């Protein structure tokens, strides 16, 4: 480690800690910067040489983290939590958790290579037929969204899960062991315990479970209604009205968001078409327009535009020069207070317009907290960070807002139109809840050792069936590693943040709508051009992780905890309607034929 980046001496106390943090701050931006830059260079241009560079950057960050980490424990370990500066306790607390820097050098290098190899396998996996092969984004994504051929959907789903998952398994095993080894030396029972610790809530798992109990009935009713809609198309051979839904028929590779099957489930087809995808295509929207339209929503609230550096640096379309890139949409803080970028393989659809807003929310958080100490440039918790963009997208998706921006010609305010909208939103927001909840239940079990490698897939499918009421459309065994075919697993990104976000965003939406002086039904609120709403959101964004999330939440919404009531209020009309409709249709809620799997198509896969 360069002498300029090494820690000096400091008194064994608060006053020494404060100069220690400022000295860290000075060195850390360079170290954070070089790490992020090397990761950017790799993820926008996946090559062996860019991986080597990213690994060397990662070693340097570990060197840095070890030096500054061990210094913190030399001086403070027996006394550190009693500092009177709460921001400084947070800075120190982060600094003294070494993580992968606890590993001896040989194991660090092993750990870094595993992350690099897992990333490459996920983002370069292909399904081949012929010499021609399909990538996840856009080819397989488009098949899952637009094919209504059972066999074609099956080919794409099976191909992807087999291509990505199978080779990932042995690496994921080794990564899990090393990660646990690392975090155990910080005093955590396992890596999952460290990940949950970010919410600073001793009742976190019980609180999540209590939220899910309130939300599950909404999901079961949506599920049953959608299952009926699918049965009407695919027939009795491939849909069991008392069984789990085949996991490939819901519009999405992970069955995590169901908005692509909206045309099959829309209650009142004769009302205005609320999926504006076909209008975006007819009007010739491109990625550029989508990012500018999203930006202009943020500036309408008197939040910040995207700086020149964002526009010059960002990757907003998949490269047409054939390069391998990480297509999974992401938002980048380079930790130099100037460079902020999005990397998205943007496609021209309504849900991608929502995703643009999501990623731009991350960026806005970065812009607003850029002058805080680098350890406090985080969301109040990770769920806050995931919620910001989704909150704006809630306003954007309203038929009134879509009309304002030229995407929906007809205006209507009737009960049928409200049901259509709320159903469309339920396919996006309610359908996700079980998946948002289950992914880290799986991963927490892997980290704790409750789920060894011998049960990776068995336990994944247990949770997929238990929560989502889906089944794999072909047989799986423990050679398959279906968890690994979801980005966040091989890319080691925690998932419970998204469950938290999906509840939180309705709390935020309710609070901002009220601050805006809106007095109508919550699901028709649009905060566009509300400078008052913008000011309230800005307070949250400027806090970063400087204060406990419970206090930030309380200032924003009047409550110091996650609460499902705003979400339930938003959806109330369609919750009631789906319940009535399922009862009238004689549906079974749930999937009591839990063992059921669909048969193979007659000629699969030669067709
Ligand atoms: C779509 O239509 C709804 C329903 O409007 C109501 O019912 C219709 C059939 C007609 O009879 C309307 O005349 C009637 O308002 C609109 O929702 C309603 O919005 C109004 C105006 O913001 C709300 O009234 C306010 O209520 C608060 C107290 O909650 C008062 O302090 C205010 O002074 C004001 O009177 C009304 O509560 C609300 N009703 C419901 C059931 O939510 C909605 O605004 C409209 N949407 C659009 C986009 O036009
Ligand atoms: C993709 O990454 C490779 C490196 O792995 C880049 O190729 C290098 O380009 C730089 C100029 O920026 C030269 O100094 C090197 O001689 C090149 N190395 C090799 C091995 O060819 C390439 O420029 C990157 N592509 C893009 C579009 O940025
Ligand atoms: C796991 O499954 C692998 C391939 O899938 C199988 O092939 C299709 C045609 C059906 O037979 C389906 O039921 C199977 O899933 C096998 O190559 C492999 O032997 C199995 N793995 C182990 C460890 O036994
Ligand atoms: Cl998280
Ligand atoms: Zn995100």
Curated annotation (Swiss-Prot):
Residues annotated as the enzyme's active site: 359, 488
Q: Any further remarks? A: Inhibitors of ACE are commonly used to treat hypertension and some types of renal and cardiac dysfunction.
Q: Where is this site: Not glycosylated?
A: 491
Question: Which consequence is recorded for altering residue 359 to D?
Answer: Abolished peptidase activity, leading to increased levels of amyloid-beta
Induction behaviour:
Up-regulated in failing heart.
Which residues of this chain are annotated as glycosylation sites?
9, 25, 45, 82, 117, 286, 413, 477
Q: Where does chloride 1 bind?
A: 199, 497
| Tissue-specificity statement | Ubiquitously expressed, with highest levels in lung, kidney, heart, gastrointestinal system and prostate.
Disease entry from the Swiss-Prot or TrEMBL record: Ischemic stroke: A stroke is an acute neurologic event leading to death of neural tissue of the brain and resulting in loss of motor, sensory and/or cognitive function. Ischemic strokes, resulting from vascular occlusion, is considered to be a highly complex disease consisting of a group of heterogeneous disorders with multiple genetic and environmental risk factors.
Its name, as the record gives it, is Angiotensin-converting enzyme
Its organism's taxonomic lineage begins at: Eukaryota, Metazoa, Chordata, Craniata, Vertebrata
Q: Which organism is it from?
A: Homo sapiens (Human)
Name the job this protein performs: Dipeptidyl carboxypeptidase that removes dipeptides from the C-terminus of a variety of circulating hormones, such as angiotensin I, bradykinin or enkephalins, thereby playing a key role in the regulation of blood pressure, electrolyte homeostasis or synaptic plasticity. Composed of two similar catalytic domains, each possessing a functional active site, with different selectivity for substrates.
Complete-protein stretch covered: 30 to 639 of 1306
Compartments where found = Cell membrane; Cytoplasm
Q: Describe its PTM?
A: Phosphorylated on tyrosine residues on its extracellular part, promoting cleavage by secretase enzymes and formation of the soluble form (Angiotensin-converting enzyme, soluble form).
